[PDB]
């Protein structure tokens, strides 16, 4: 049983490898060879939000495409007004090392987590007129890498202890535990219908989870190093991942395999952020060489560059109406492009 | 109102920006340290009215390649050493040669003839300064271990970060962080 199961485990690895190749009748780069490419996309910095003292690890857009939360490692959680560049809130965090932040789709709460292994939920709309921490989702055994609201009372978090968790905010206990990853779960992405979510870990693997049942549906290999970023296609039938191998890859949930690879010879730095446009035709990816590279998600052609940051680009997010792209970086600046 | 909803928004912004200015004074007055070797423990000690903040990582997994690039802007990484000696020589090798910790200095606190065969043909340098009482067996071992970490430091130093090996104090960390800041200032002026 100690090794007769390792022999049986690869009997299914080669069976899944053959079911994925039998359906690989074509290539995304073969059937999109006749579509017209996108023009050279030259987006310029519209706003530059200053006010963070240290590195910025995460930002998240609001659903109204106007407010955005930002998380810096100096111990602040600043809520901005992207149109006016006015700071709306500034929440002093108890732990200084926060690696993620989320914005509730209602706009009432913001999440935050980091090396304290705790997800803090901050109530923005309080009657007494202040931002107070409402809940502290403790019990996750490893640093929080990502967190995403499902409702005002439900949130999925990934942690560095190889485990994702689904929390009921009012009671404060995990309703589901998503185990199966081998390394630190570094990011997660919710589906547009919030029925599934995908997560990438440090084992060069990405898993598709079912929020309601709690099982792992599909596992997507193909990357060579830790997956640092992940994002669904706008229609929720595909997702893109970013890895330390310096490539991005597009996986299809139904074909159950990798469709396209976004790599370049002059690129030898890891991808820290991955986001899609509103249409899904573009693929904006933040890198370690301090600039972002807009890709043509249908032809794998480098379409543009967002080069305005002085340090490593950490976070990157597109508005819900596709109007602007906000990127944070270790130089403590948030630049909004268009 | 288009005009009164923006003045009340600039009235709140100026109150946010005047508080971030006070927080910037405390953030720059404090020196952040990472003790290496809840989810993170904070130790706020003070030496001669200088605020320090040591952060023991606490309850994290044995895989550090992801949460250790958080501590790339700390003043110094305090590396405590206690085979367990070669494992600390490889952990120092990765911290020293990491692309994000290449500007962070390391303060080394050092709390065997079979694990290291080059220890037999090793003579204590005449530059050694021991206090009387230590037999030549422990003094030759204290300086051989120190010469193993300085071999990693002098191979890839380049002038961005420095190693401060010691033997076993917070006064040494106080005196070593001042040397780190002074060299950081001399490097900005290109005097070094």
């Amino acid at each position, epitope marked *: 049983e100690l090794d007769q199961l390792r022999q049986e485990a690869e009997q299914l690895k080669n069976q899944i490898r053959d079911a994925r190749k039998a359906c690989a009748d074509a290539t995304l780069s073969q059937i999109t060879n006749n579509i017209d490419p996108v023009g050279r996309i030259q987006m310029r910095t519209r706003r530059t939000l200053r006010g963070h003292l240290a590195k910025i690890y995460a930002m998240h857009w609001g659903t109204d495409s106007r407010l955005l939360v930002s998380a810096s490692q100096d111990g602040k959680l600043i809520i901005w007004d992207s149109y006016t560049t006015n700071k709306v809130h500034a929440i002093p965090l108890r732990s200084s090392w926060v690696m993620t932040c989320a914005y509730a789709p209602s706009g009432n709460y913001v999440a935050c987590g980091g090396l304290d292994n705790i997800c803090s939920i901050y109530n923005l709309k309080t009657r007494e007129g202040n931002v107070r921490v409402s809940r502290e989702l403790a019990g996750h055994t490893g640093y929080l890498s990502c967190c995403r609201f499902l409702d005002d009372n439900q949130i999925v978090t990934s942690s560095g202890d190889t485990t994702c968790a689904l929390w009921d905010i009012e009671t404060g206990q995990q309703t589901t535990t998503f185990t199966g990853h081998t390394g630190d779960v570094m990011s997660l992405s919710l589906a547009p219908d919030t029925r599934l979510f995908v997560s990438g870990a440090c084992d060069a693997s990405a898993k598709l989870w079912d929020v309601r049942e709690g099982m792992c549906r599909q596992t997507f290999t193909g990357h060579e190093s830790d997956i640092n970023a992940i994002c669904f296609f706008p229609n929720g039938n595909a997702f893109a991942t970013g890895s*330390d*191998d310096a490539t991005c890859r597009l996986f299809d949930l139904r074909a159950d395999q990798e469709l396209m690879t976004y790599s370049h010879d002059n690129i030898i730095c890891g991808i820290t952020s991955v986001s899609f446009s509103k249409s899904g035709r573009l693929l904006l990816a933040g890198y370690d060489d301090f600039n972002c590279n807009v890709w043509d998600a249908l032809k794998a052609d480098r379409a543009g560059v967002l080069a305005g940051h002085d340090n490593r680009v950490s976070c990157l997010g597109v508005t819900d109406d596709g109007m602007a792209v906000a990127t944070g970086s270790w130089d403590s600046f948030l630049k909004i492009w268009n | 109102d288009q005009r009164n909803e923006e003045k009340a928004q600039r009235e709140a912004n100026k109150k946010i920006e005047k508080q971030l200015q006070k927080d910037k004074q405390v953030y720059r007055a404090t020196h952040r340290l990472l003790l290496l070797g809840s989810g993170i423990f904070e130790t706020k000690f003070q030496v001669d009215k200088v605020n320090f903040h040591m952060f023991d990582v606490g309850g994290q997994r044995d895989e550090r390649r992801k949460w250790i690039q958080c501590f790339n802007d700390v003043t110094a990484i305090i590396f405590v050493v206690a085979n367990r000696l070669q494992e600390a020589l490889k952990l120092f090798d990765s*911290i020293w040669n990491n692309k994000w910790l290449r500007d962070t200095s390391v303060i080394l606190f050092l709390n065997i003839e079979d694990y290291f065969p080059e220890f037999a043909r090793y003579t204590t340098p005449e530059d050694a300064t021991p206090e009387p009482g230590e037999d030549p067996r422990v003094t030759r071992a204290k300086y051989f271990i120190r010469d193993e970490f300085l071999r990693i430091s002098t191979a890839s130093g380049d002038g961005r970060h420095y190693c401060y090996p010691h033997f076993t104090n917070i006064r040494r960390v106080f005196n070593d962080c001042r040397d780190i800041i002074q060299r950081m200032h001399l490097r900005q002026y290109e005097l070094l």
Partner: nanobody
Amino acid sequence: QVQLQESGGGLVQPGGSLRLSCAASGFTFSNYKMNWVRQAPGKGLEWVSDISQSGASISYTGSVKGRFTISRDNAKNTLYLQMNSLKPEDTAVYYCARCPAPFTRDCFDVTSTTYAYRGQGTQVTV
């Protein structure tokens, strides 16, 4: 998929030689620094030897210098470990560890926690 399969191994008399192999798959072998990591029965994982992306900056642990020699073949994606004059304290499960990022000089690949980029090990008994 990153796959590292170790071969060689086997029981050998004290003083005999042994050659370990490592067939790598699912990644560009030339971009990574490869390691060798063992686990003695009763102890934890300890690092044995590493080799650079090309094969220039070779390193060993003190207990194996002069006996072991690590070598790689980037043309066929194979990592080697020629173990000469073995002694009974070299009995362990030898893993072919790869450190996670390419084009780097730092590796964190001896973790007692489940580490992803290393093989299943080959048993060496002396």
